[PDB]
Write a protein that binds this ligand. Structure first.
Ligand SMILES: [Zn+2]
Ligand SMILES: [Zn+2]
Ligand SMILES: [Zn+2]
Ligand SMILES: [Zn+2]
Ligand SMILES: [Zn+2]
Ligand SMILES: [Zn+2]
Lengths: 96, 56, 88, 143, 303, 48, 56, 197
């Protein structure tokens, strides 16, 4: 009982254990943008309970949008914001 | 003058060590691989005025 | 499960496998080339950094002195390409 | 006075009908070169240059591939004399790359993580309506 | 036994999807994302002698014949390569698929046949002498793992439809459906006897299915747990021991899983991989294991 | 000798600081366990 | 050529506007010097013709 | 001496609410805000509307005082250092005057680099005896209002010409007639007259 939460954890340098991973670039950045866009992603922890597959985030919106990523065609398509357009490049001081 | 230019040519031809095959370095290919150099096409006088202002 | 769920699972495996093994993601893929820039870009950069007295460009004062060690090489590449009296 | 041209041969056939507007785009570029930076940030002051360069290149692109109003001879004259960008035209003929602002905004060497700019992300995939100005370019969503 | 136990092997450059022991057990072929095939020794100092190019894609599945003569490679540029075990030449390249070839398998002891499955929904049969597909089975969905029986009469196929399907070559009809996996099947392996077939699936359950003329009709023989599948969605492969006594399965939590086939007990949980594991394989004579993972390295465990 | 040669190279790198000026993109991955678990922290996870 | 207290000229206006003042360029005989006359005073003369040089 | 150690020593309210982080490593980027010797600066973005936080102090100056390199709070509890030393003893006595500080830093750097590289070299034995009042006001869930972009100083003069595009907050700064406003770096780090604490 003579150790704390930090002192009982299997740590490597003062704040935890840090080991080199070799995750595929695409899948990593996929789950990264999945969390950064909606608020959920799959769990990259390698044991955590050693049963199947849990989502880690705002898990309530995960089942609402079926667990989609950014690279996939979305469910919702509504309320687009309206912008000007002058794609001709022929009128000077009117092109954008 | 002709004698001295002959002297310079003979000192070139004497002390010719062969090219000494190294590993090629390519400094400007290493500069433009970075995110700090861009490339363009300019008149030579514009670049000379640039180089003089930069040295100043 | 249902045909809808299995078709959605097919879509969200085909899109994944398409975007994960693209031609631009193979191992020895040298990515695209740095291209030419418009010649007005370096002109306005040189012109705004006038004599480096503005307070707005005080973070690039350190880089110009750093570039001082490569001025002889820039001089060499400059004078190497002098334009040849039959050229305007 | 002129663009002083570097060919010394006479310009090709359809030149005189695209010359007022090319000289008008060129006048707009000489205005943007001399705009004094005051309330125009350190990256914001180079945003007109990439925009007008896009505009001149899109003008010759629209006349040769869409409207078909320029021959090969006139088209390649305008590329040699510096009115269009041969490399930006070459990207606009690719499939997804068709409103591309800059060649910088697809250059992966210019970024920290070896990636494009968020300029190039499809606006549906940001999902929120966040407003974006690319730092290179000033662009708001090419793609 | 050879050298000292471990014998870590490097030289690869990207992920390593597949690896196979030679039918005599004296050399090794490894392959992955590197668009390269490496032929290395199992004995001596385990050093490279042959590098085999000839792809524009990721070399998904690797196999052998039963002789150790013909090397079959399934790649991610819709083609399959057929090579000789020695001398290293492109002997037969076969192009019939419209999408990515996930797996291949050679029919053994019969006339030369290869069956492949691809992401377009197709399971195709291939005679090496004909330069053409022999039979084509549109399932409807993406197919990940494909193998034969010993009789060269059935195609045992795993896809993403949570259902192992067995095709008869003579009737050309859907003979068997095997239910019991809750997520996509990523790897199949038929035993040395032909009695049992081992399956990985994304639902993290490793299943043994008996393929026999006479069936109990509910073929849920043996169930293994502990195998982890994750967000990386890798194609995970399984392998039988030469005597059918040990079972290996790749895992995405960097642990080499080897079960005992009779007690359903985890024999070995060998560590030593930084990245997730793709294929674990047994030496055909001796208890030596090549394990291949996404950390670009190979491991030779000596039991 | 293998330990010494590395320190030698790190010393000698000053003698030519810029000859073929350097190159850097081995973008790598590392798995990290926060040792803080009690989850409200990753979002509910044990590693990152 | 310029004075010591004279700041260097801007390239933009002062030389983009001005015509470049014809170079030296000996007049070549159109009959006697015919296979040379088209390209002789160019920068890199026969660069864009694949028959006489390779590429760029 | 330089610092140069991989992968910084961070808490969980600064490392972000996303389990997938992309950080950059600059070898000898800044100088330490305390030690004044150059160290390896790591720059990451926690979430979506965050600020791109970076490490402020050395690995060594966090090993001395068991803190995170950017919030300067205890790795275990998440509290200021004056609170933790109040609920402990104060026997470190790091020097504040110049030559003494660099001398103490040199000697403690030799001490740490003549050891394992895992323990808070002096704070360990006293870090065994714990669970004073600090545990009854330890923060339970992360305060993600720390990772938050500063007040737009052009919006304070009512002249923010970026408007909706500016990534800095358009909301009130704190009244400077407040004890909770001054907060020097070294005052937060040595445990001396910290108003939060
Ligand atoms: Zn952009
Ligand atoms: Zn742009
Ligand atoms: Zn853009
Ligand atoms: Zn420090
Ligand atoms: Zn912190
Ligand atoms: Zn603002």
């Amino acid at each position: 009982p003579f150790r704390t939460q930090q002192m009982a954890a299997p740590r490597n340098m003062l704040s935890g254990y840090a080991e080199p991973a070799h995750i595929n670039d695409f899948m990593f950045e996929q789950q990264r943008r999945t969390f950064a866009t909606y608020g959920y992603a799959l769990d990259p922890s390698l044991d955590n309970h050693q049963v199947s597959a849990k989502y880690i985030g705002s898990v309530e919106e995960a089942e609402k949008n079926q667990g989609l990523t950014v690279f996939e065609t979305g469910q919702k398509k509504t309320e687009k914001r309206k912008k000007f357009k002058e794609n001709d490049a022929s009128n000077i001081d009117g092109f954008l | 003058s002709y004698q001295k230019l002959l002297k310079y040519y003979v000192l070139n031809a004497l002390k010719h060590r062969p090219p000494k095959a190294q590993k090629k370095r390519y400094l400007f290919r290493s500069f433009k691989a970075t995110k700090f150099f861009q490339s363009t096409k300019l008149d030579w006088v514009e670049v000379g005025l640039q180089v003089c202002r930069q040295g100043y | 499960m249902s045909e809808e769920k299995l078709q959605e699972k097919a879509r969200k495996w085909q899109q994944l496998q398409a975007k994960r093994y693209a031609e631009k993601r193979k191992f020895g893929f040298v990515d695209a080339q740095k291209e030419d820039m418009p010649p007005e870009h370096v002109r306005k950069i040189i012109r705004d950094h006038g004599d480096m007295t503005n307070r707005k460009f005080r973070h690039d004062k350190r880089v110009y002195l750093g570039a001082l060690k490569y001025m002889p090489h820039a001089v060499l590449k400059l004078l190497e390409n002098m334009p040849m009296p039959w050229e305007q | 006075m002129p663009k002083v041209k570097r060919s010394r041969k006479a310009p090709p056939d359809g030149w005189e009908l695209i010359e007022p507007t090319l000289d008008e785009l060129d006048q707009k570029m000489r205005e943007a070169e001399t705009e004094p930076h005051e309330g125009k940030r350190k990256v914001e002051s180079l945003w007109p240059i990439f925009r007008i360069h896009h505009q001149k290149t899109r003008y010759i692109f629209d006349l040769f591939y869409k409207r078909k109003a320029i021959s090969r001879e006139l088209y390649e004259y305008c590329i040699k004399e510096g009115y269009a960008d041969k490399n930006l035209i070459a990207k606009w003929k690719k499939q997804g790359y068709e409103n591309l602002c800059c060649l910088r905004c697809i250059q992966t060497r210019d970024t920290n993580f070896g990636t494009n700019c968020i300029c190039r992300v499809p606006k549906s995939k940001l999902e929120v309506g966040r407003i974006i100005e690319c730092t290179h370019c000033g662009c708001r969503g090419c793609s | 036994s050879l050298q000292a136990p471990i014998m870590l092997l490097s030289g690869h450059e990207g992920e390593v999807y597949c690896c196979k022991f030679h039918p005599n057990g004296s050399t090794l072929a490894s392959a992955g994302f590197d668009r390269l095939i490496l032929l290395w020794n199992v004995y001596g100092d385990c050093d490279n002698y042959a590098t085999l190019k000839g792809h524009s894609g990721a070399v998904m599945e690797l196999h052998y014949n039963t002789d150790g003569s013909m090397l079959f490679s399934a790649s991610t540029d819709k083609t399959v390569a057929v090579w000789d075990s020695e001398t290293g030449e492109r002997v037969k390249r076969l192009k019939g698929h419209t999408s990515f070839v996930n797996s291949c398998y050679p029919a053994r002891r019969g006339p030369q046949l290869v069956c492949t499955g691809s992401d377009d929904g197709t399971v195709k049969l291939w005679d090496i002498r004909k330069k053409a597909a022999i039979q084509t089975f549109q399932n409807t969905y993406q197919v990940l793992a494909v193998t034969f029986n010993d009789t060269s009469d059935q195609i045992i196929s795993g896809g993403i439809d949570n259902d192992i399907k067995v095709w008869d070559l003579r009737q050309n009809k859907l003979t068997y459906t095997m239910r019991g996996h809750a997520d996509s099947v990523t790897g199949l392996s038929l035993s040395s006897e032909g009695s049992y077939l081992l399956s990985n699936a994304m639902d993290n359950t490793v299943r043994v299915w008996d393929v026999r003329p006479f069936a109990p009709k509910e073929r849920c023989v043996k169930i293994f747990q502990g195998n982890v599948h994750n967000f990386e969605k890798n194609l995970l492969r399984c392998s039988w021991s030469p005597d059918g006594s040990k079972i290996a399965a790749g895992s995405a939590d960097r642990f080499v899983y080897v079960w005992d086939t009779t007690s359903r007990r985890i024999l070995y949980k060998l560590p030593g991989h930084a990245g997730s594991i793709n294929e674990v394989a047994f030496h055909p004579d001796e208890p030596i294991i090549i394990s291949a993972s996404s950390d670009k390295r190979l491991y030779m465990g000596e039991i | 000798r293998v330990a010494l040669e590395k320190s030698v190279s790190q010393k000698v790198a000053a003698a030519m600081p810029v000859r073929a000026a350097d190159k850097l993109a081995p973008a790598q991955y590392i798995r990290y366990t926060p040792s803080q678990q009690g989850v409200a922290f990753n979002s509910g996870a044990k590693q990152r | 050529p310029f004075d010591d207290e004279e700041p260097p000229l801007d390239y933009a206006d002062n030389i983009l506007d001005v015509e470049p003042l014809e170079a030296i360029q000996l007049e070549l005989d159109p009959e006697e010097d015919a296979p040379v006359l088209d390209w002789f005073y160019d920068h890199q003369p026969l660069r864009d013709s694949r028959k006489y040089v390779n590429g760029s | 001496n330089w610092e140069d150690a991989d992968f910084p020593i961070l808490c969980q309210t600064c490392l972000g609410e996303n389990p997938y982080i992309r950080m950059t490593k600059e070898k000898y980027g800044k100088e330490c805000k305390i030690c004044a010797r150059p160290f390896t600066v790591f720059r990451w973005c926690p979430g979506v509307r965050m600020r791109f936080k970076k490490t402020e102090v050395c690995q060594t100056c966090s090993k001395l005082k068991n803190v995170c390199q950017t919030c300067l709070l205890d790795l275990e509890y998440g509290l200021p250092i004056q609170v933790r030393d109040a609920g402990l003893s104060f026997k470190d006595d790091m020097p504040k005057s110049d030559v003494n500080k660099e001398y103490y830093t040199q000697n403690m750097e030799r001490e740490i680099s003549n050891s394992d590289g895992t323990r808070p070299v002096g704070m360990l034995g006293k870090a065994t005896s714990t669970s004073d009042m600090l545990l009854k006001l330890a923060r339970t869930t992360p305060y993600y209002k720390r990772n938050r972009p500063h007040i737009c100083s052009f919006w304070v003069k009512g002249e923010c010409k970026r408007g909706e595009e500016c990534p800095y907050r358009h909301e009130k700064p704190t009244d400077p007639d407040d004890p909770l406003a001054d907060q020097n770096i070294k005052d937060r780090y040595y445990g001396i007259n910290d108003p939060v604490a």
